[PDB]
Amino acid sequence: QTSTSSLAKQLFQMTWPMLFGVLSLMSFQLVDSAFIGQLGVLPLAAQGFTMPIQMVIIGIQVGLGIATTAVISRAIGAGKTEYAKQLGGLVIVIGGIGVALIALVLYLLRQPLLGLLGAPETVFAIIDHYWLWWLASAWTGAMLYFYYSVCRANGNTLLPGTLMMVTSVLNLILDPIFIFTFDLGIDGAAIATIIAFGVGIAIVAPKVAQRQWTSYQWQDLNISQSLTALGHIMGPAMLSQLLPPLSSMFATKLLASFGTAAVAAWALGSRFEFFALVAVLAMTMSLPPMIGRMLGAKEITHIRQLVRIACQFVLGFQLLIALVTYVFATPLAELMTSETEVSQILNLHLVIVPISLGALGICMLMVSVANALGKSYVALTISALRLFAFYLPCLWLGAHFYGIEGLFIGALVGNIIAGWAAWLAYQKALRSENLYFQ
C-alpha cells in the first residue's frame, strides 16, 4: 500500500505545476481579452476571425506534443537514452519547419480563408499586418510548447509549469505597454506575446540541452522509422482536436433557436465547465509521460494502479465541485451576469451539468492514457464516440422534446455514457494485447 501511496504522491507532484501553469495562462488571457476590448469594433472583429485559424495551429502543436510525450517517454523507459534525445531534437526540427510552412501558406491564402468565413472586406486591411505579427507569435508559442513537451517526456513538469507562469506574467506586463503606450493596438498584443514566449524559449532551450534531452547527432538515427513512430500518434491525435470545433458547430445551430439569452448562458456555462475541469486538464499533461515511461520499463502493474488512482481523484474531485456548485448555483449565476434572463438559464445549467463532469473527466483521461500507451486509434475512437454517438445525439434529443432544459439533461446523459464507454474501451484495449510482451 506504500506503492499506491507513492504513486499518488508522484502524480500529485507531477500534476500541480501543470495546474498552476494552466491557471497562470488563463489569468493572462482573461485580462488580455479586456485590453483588446478597448480597441474597437474592427480590431475585435479582426481578432474574432483569428480564433479559428488559431484552433488549427493549436490542434497541430498539441497533436505533436502528444506524440512527442508518448514516444520519447517510452523510449526512456526502455533504456534507449541516445535514441530518446535524438527524438527530442527531431521533434524540435519537425515542429519548427512544419509550423513555419503552415504559417506561410495561411498568410498566403488569407483572403480566400477570410472569404469562406464570410469576413467583410473591411477586416482585410487589419489582417494584412496583424497576421504577420500574430502568426509569428503562433510559431514562437508552438516552439516553446514543443520544448515543454520534451521536458514532460523526460518526466519534468515543474520547469514548463514554472515558465508558463513566468511568460503569463511577462505577457501581462508587456500587453498594455505595446497595445496602448506604443499605440500598436492589435499588433501590440501579438508583439507582447512574441517577446514573452521568446523569453521562455531563451530560458528553456539551454536547460533542455544541458540535461541532454535533445541531440542533433543523427548519424545512427533511422529518420523514416522515427517519423513513422511519431506520425502513428500525431495523425489520429490531430484528428481528435478537429472534433470539438464540429461539436460547437452542431451546438450553435441548436442553441441559437432558443434565443440570444440561451446562447449567452451556454457560453458562460461552457466557461465554467472549463474551469471546473482544470485539474483534469492538468492531469492529461502530467499522466501520459508517467504512463509512457512505465510502459517502456514494463511496469505494467504500476500503470494499472496509477490510472485507477487518477480515476478515483477525478470522480471524487468533480463530485465535490458539483456539490459546491449545486448549493451555490443561484448566487454564482447572478455573479457571472447581471442579465436576469441569462442568469436564470445559467442557474439551470449549474445544477444539471456539473455532476456529469466527473464522467467527462474520465473520458478525457482515457484518451490521454490510450495515446500514452501508443494506442492512438483507440484514443481517436473514444473521442469520436463521445462526440457523434453520445453527446450530440443526446443534446439534440433533449432540445427537441424539452427545449433548453432538456438540452442540459442531454449533456448530462451524454457525458455519463461517454465516460462509461471510455472506461470500457480502455479495459478492452488492455485485453487486446498483453502489455508484458508488447
Task: State the DSSP string of 152-181.
Answer: HHTT--HHHHHHHHHHHHHHHHHHHIIIII
Which of these, 406, 49, 52, lies nearest to 254 by C-alpha position?
Answer: 406
The span from the CA of 150 to the CA of 80, in Å, is 15
Alpha helices in 37-157 (DSSP H): 41-48, 51-77, 81-108, 110-116, 121-153
Residue of 72, 376, 426 whose CA lies nearest to 234: 376
Extract the C-alpha cell encoding 57: 495551429
SS3 349: helix
Measured in residues, the chain has a length of 438
Alpha helices by DSSP H, 257-354 = 260-276, 278-296, 300-327, 329-336, 340-352
Residue pair 171/193 in contact (Cβ under 8 Å)? The answer is yes
Measuring CA to CA, how many Å separate 294 from each of 16, 101, 156, 223, 399? 20, 35, 15, 25, 45
C-beta separation of 171 from 24 below 8 A:
no
Query: What is the rounded CA–CA span in Å between residue 84 and residue 93?
Result: 15
Q: How far apart are CA 294 and CA 151, in angstroms?
A: 16
Name the nearest CA neighbour of 35 among 173, 130, 158, 163: 173
Q: Provide CB contacts within 8 A for 116, sequence distance 6+.
A: none
Query: Which among 165, 231, 214, 129 is positioned nearest to 17, based on CA atoms?
Result: 165
Is residue 52 within 8 Å of 117, Cβ to Cβ? yes
The boundaries of the domain holding residue 435 are 1-438
Resolution of the determined structure in angstroms stands at 2.2
With b meaning 16 or more CB within 10 Å and e meaning fewer, what string describes 110-134? beebbeeeebeeebeebbeebbebb
Residues 6+ apart with CB under 8 A from 222: none
For 317-338, b/e burial (b = at least 16 CB within 10 A) is bbeebbeebeeebeebbbebbe
Query: How far is the C-alpha of 363 from the C-alpha of 382, rounded, in Å?
Result: 7
DSSP helix/strand/coil, 10: helix
* 165 touches 23 (CB < 8 A): no
Residue 400: how many other CB atoms lie within 10 Å: 12
Q: Round to whole Å and give the CA distance between 358 and 356.
A: 5
Helix axes 278-296, 2-36, angle to 10 degrees: 130
Task: Give CA–CA dist 138/415, Å, rounded.
Answer: 32
Q: What is the number of structural domains in the chain? A: 1
Backbone angles phi, psi at 136, to 5 degrees: -65, -40
For 206, other C-beta atoms within 10 Å of its C-beta total 10
Instruction: Compute φ and ψ for 39, nearest 5 degrees.
Output: -75, -45
- Give CA torsion, residues 38, 43, 49, 51, to 10 deg: -40
In angstroms, rounded to a whole number, what is the distance separating the alpha carbons of residues 321 and 358? 9
| Cα–Cα distance for residue pair 365/254, rounded to 1 Å | 28
| Close Cβ partners of 264 (under 8 Å, ≥ 6 residues apart) | 337, 339, 342
Q: Tell me the C-alpha distance between 117 and 127, whole Å.
A: 14
Instruction: Kindly state the cell numbers that stand for 328.
Output: 451555490
Residue type, 305: Q
Name the residue among 129, 150, 159, 161 with its Cα closest to residue 64.
150
